[PDB]
Each structure stands twice: as C-alpha cells, then as structure tokens.
Enzyme design. Sequence first.
Site, short mmCIF file in Angstrom:
data_model
loop_
_atom_site.label_atom_id
_atom_site.label_comp_id
_atom_site.label_asym_id
_atom_site.label_seq_id
_atom_site.Cartn_x
_atom_site.Cartn_y
_atom_site.Cartn_z
N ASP A 1 9.54 18.00 6.15
CA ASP A 1 8.88 17.29 5.03
C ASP A 1 7.36 17.54 5.03
O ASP A 1 6.53 16.62 4.88
CB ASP A 1 9.18 15.80 5.06
CG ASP A 1 8.93 15.14 3.72
OD1 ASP A 1 8.79 15.87 2.71
OD2 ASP A 1 8.87 13.89 3.68
N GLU B 1 8.84 0.86 1.33
CA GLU B 1 7.79 -0.13 1.08
C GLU B 1 6.87 -0.13 2.29
O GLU B 1 7.32 -0.26 3.40
CB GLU B 1 8.38 -1.51 0.89
CG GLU B 1 7.38 -2.60 0.52
CD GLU B 1 8.07 -3.93 0.20
OE1 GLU B 1 7.38 -4.94 0.02
OE2 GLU B 1 9.32 -3.99 0.11
N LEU B 2 5.59 0.07 2.05
CA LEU B 2 4.58 0.06 3.10
C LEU B 2 3.62 -1.04 2.73
O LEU B 2 3.21 -1.13 1.58
CB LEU B 2 3.83 1.40 3.16
CG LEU B 2 2.82 1.58 4.31
CD1 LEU B 2 3.53 1.88 5.58
CD2 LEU B 2 1.83 2.69 4.08
N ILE C 1 0.86 -1.17 0.00
CA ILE C 1 0.00 0.00 0.00
C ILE C 1 0.90 1.23 0.00
O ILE C 1 0.49 2.31 -0.43
CB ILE C 1 -1.00 0.00 1.20
CG1 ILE C 1 -0.29 0.09 2.55
CG2 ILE C 1 -1.83 -1.27 1.21
CD1 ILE C 1 -1.22 0.20 3.78
N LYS D 1 5.88 -0.79 7.73
CA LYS D 1 6.93 -0.19 6.90
C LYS D 1 8.13 -1.12 6.94
O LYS D 1 8.51 -1.56 8.00
CB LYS D 1 7.28 1.24 7.41
CG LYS D 1 7.87 2.14 6.35
CD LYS D 1 7.88 3.61 6.76
CE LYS D 1 8.69 4.46 5.75
NZ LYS D 1 9.01 5.82 6.25
N1 LIG Z 1 0.10 4.64 9.17
C1 LIG Z 1 -0.50 4.79 7.97
N2 LIG Z 1 -1.80 4.48 7.85
C2 LIG Z 1 -2.42 4.58 6.68
N3 LIG Z 1 -1.81 5.01 5.59
C3 LIG Z 1 -0.52 5.38 5.63
C4 LIG Z 1 0.17 5.27 6.83
C5 LIG Z 1 1.46 5.69 6.52
I1 LIG Z 1 3.14 5.83 7.84
C6 LIG Z 1 1.52 6.05 5.23
N4 LIG Z 1 0.32 5.85 4.68
C7 LIG Z 1 0.01 6.16 3.20
O1 LIG Z 1 1.21 6.02 2.36
C8 LIG Z 1 1.41 7.21 1.61
C9 LIG Z 1 2.95 7.40 1.50
O2 LIG Z 1 3.52 7.78 2.78
C10 LIG Z 1 0.73 8.33 2.44
O3 LIG Z 1 0.35 9.46 1.61
C11 LIG Z 1 -0.47 7.64 3.12
O4 LIG Z 1 -1.73 7.76 2.39
#
Ligand SMILES: Nc1ncnc2c1c(I)cn2[C@@H]1O[C@H](CO)[C@@H](O)[C@H]1O
EC number: 2.7.11.1
Length: 289
Positions: A116, A10-11, A9, A26
């Site tokens: 940022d 590297e995440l 969704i 992450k």
């Molecule tokens: N903890 C979270 N819960 C839900 N979504 C998350 C996070 C995180 I850390 C990041 N994101 C989504 O990933 C996009 C890139 O950072 C961001 O723009 C965001 O949409």
Amino acid sequence: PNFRVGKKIELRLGKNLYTNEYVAIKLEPIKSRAPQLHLEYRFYKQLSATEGVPQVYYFGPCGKYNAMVLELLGPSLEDLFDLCDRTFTLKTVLMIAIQLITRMEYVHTKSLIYRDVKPENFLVGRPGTKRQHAIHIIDFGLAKEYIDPETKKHIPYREHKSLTGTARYMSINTHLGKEQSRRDDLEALGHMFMYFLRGSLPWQGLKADTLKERYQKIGDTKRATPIEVLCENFPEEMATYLRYVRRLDFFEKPDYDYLRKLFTDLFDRSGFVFDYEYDWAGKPLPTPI
Ligand SMILES: Nc1ncnc2c1c(I)cn2[C@@H]1O[C@H](CO)[C@@H](O)[C@H]1O
C-alpha cells in the site's frame, strides 16, 4: 495506559491522561464481522523496534469499539506535496527515497510486504519533536507476511489475484494479478518518486467503465510507457532504479544497498547536503491540534 478520545482526524485525536501528550486513536466497531484492526496491531508490534514507524501504546476496548492507540505524527508527503505546489526538488525526493528504501528494507527484514505504497501513508514526525524530520510508514491494513513462520519459506508464486490498492503507484506485475512480493513494494516507491519529480504520472486521470477496467487501462499505459520516457529530463539513476526493480524475480531479495548507493552517489555528486531541509522547510504545516 489511560487515554481519552476526541474529534475525527475512523481515526481520532486523543490524549494520554498522565502525560497530557496527544495521540492518534484508530477505532473499529467491537461488533465487527471481519475485524481487521487487531491484525494491523500485530504488524506494528512485529515492527516495534524501529523509529520509522509510529509507536503503539494500546490495543483493546474503548466502549462500543476496539481501539489502537498510536503515536501522533506530522503531515503526509501528499499533504506536503500539495503545500509545495505538487512538485518536489531532486534533493527532497532523494532524501525521501534514501529513507524509504531503508524503511521498506526494514519491513521486508521483518518478513512482511507492505502492498500500500502511496504518499498519504508516509508521514513526517510531529513538528517540534526530535524525529520531526524523519519519514515514517503507517497503515499496515494491506500488509502480508511473505515468509511462512513455521516453514520459514517464502510464500508461493500465484496468479489471478484480485486488485486492491491505489492503481496509480502499483507495479506492473501487480496490475497483472500476480502475488505481490518485495519487488513490487520497491517498484511502487519508484513510481512515487517519479510522481514527486514530474508533478504527475502519465497514467493519472484515466477513467473506465468500471474500477476493474480502470486498473487494466492504467496497467496498459504503464506497460506502454518506456522508462526512458517516464524519466526523460531526470537523472539516469531514476531509470536505473526502475529498470532494476522491474526486472526482479518474484522470490528475489533486492539489493537495497545498491539502490541506496545509486541515490546517495547522485546526492553527493549533485553537491547536496543531507540537512533534512526539505522543500517544505519553514512553511507552516497543518495540524489537528
Ligand atoms: N499516527 C498518525 N499520526 C498522525 N496522523 C496520522 C497518523 C495515522 I496511523 C494516520 N494519520 C493521517 O490520516 C491519514 C489517513 O491515513 C494519513 O494520510 C495521515 O495524514
């Protein structure tokens, strides 16, 4: 605790095995030269005690990676901006702004500058939750301690810094290669607030022979765009905010209460109610789930 990892969704999307709650994970290669994720973990922990950041549940190995497991939040303000045809109403910008000044104050209060600011890095809570309407700050990959922890003293003024960051929101002094400090986080927010109101910033879309020169070209245009012009046809408080933060000295502590009153006065005068009813209220929001 115990977590399982799913799709990108590297995440990645993940799940807490005992609660069946979704989480965000992450990932950083365990064999990385230049590991940074542990440093970002450190920052989130420094900031744990507020509800305006995601909770972190774990840092350590998930296989061939190190993993940071965090609370899963909702869409970013950029996501919602797109949903709302790339303009926000004054009420919605003000609700955002009042929250984010407080959020930035809290980061600064914990001896960190963020560096940022961009709409992608501010997320609403997860639809259906208690804090679903709160705006959260994420991604401390660029953050930095501005107070040395032994000396307890502010970091020294420095020039000729090399530019990393989203050129669009950055402060004029950042563009110039100066060490970023508190002021710059607040100027960048101000640029983002105008972005929301106008739909765009006049230095968007600029291109150059290199990324370095694109930063320079964008900086030139920011310097050549008077606040009076940038905030033309919008409340004076917007310009007042921008002038204030543009004039702050490197070591100067901002008056966060003052900036917040600018906006909270205007909010009330405008007859708005702090109902957390944003432009995107009632709209169907995106999710990975
Ligand atoms: N903890 C979270 N819960 C839900 N979504 C998350 C996070 C995180 I850390 C990041 N994101 C989504 O990933 C996009 C890139 O950072 C961001 O723009 C965001 O949409």
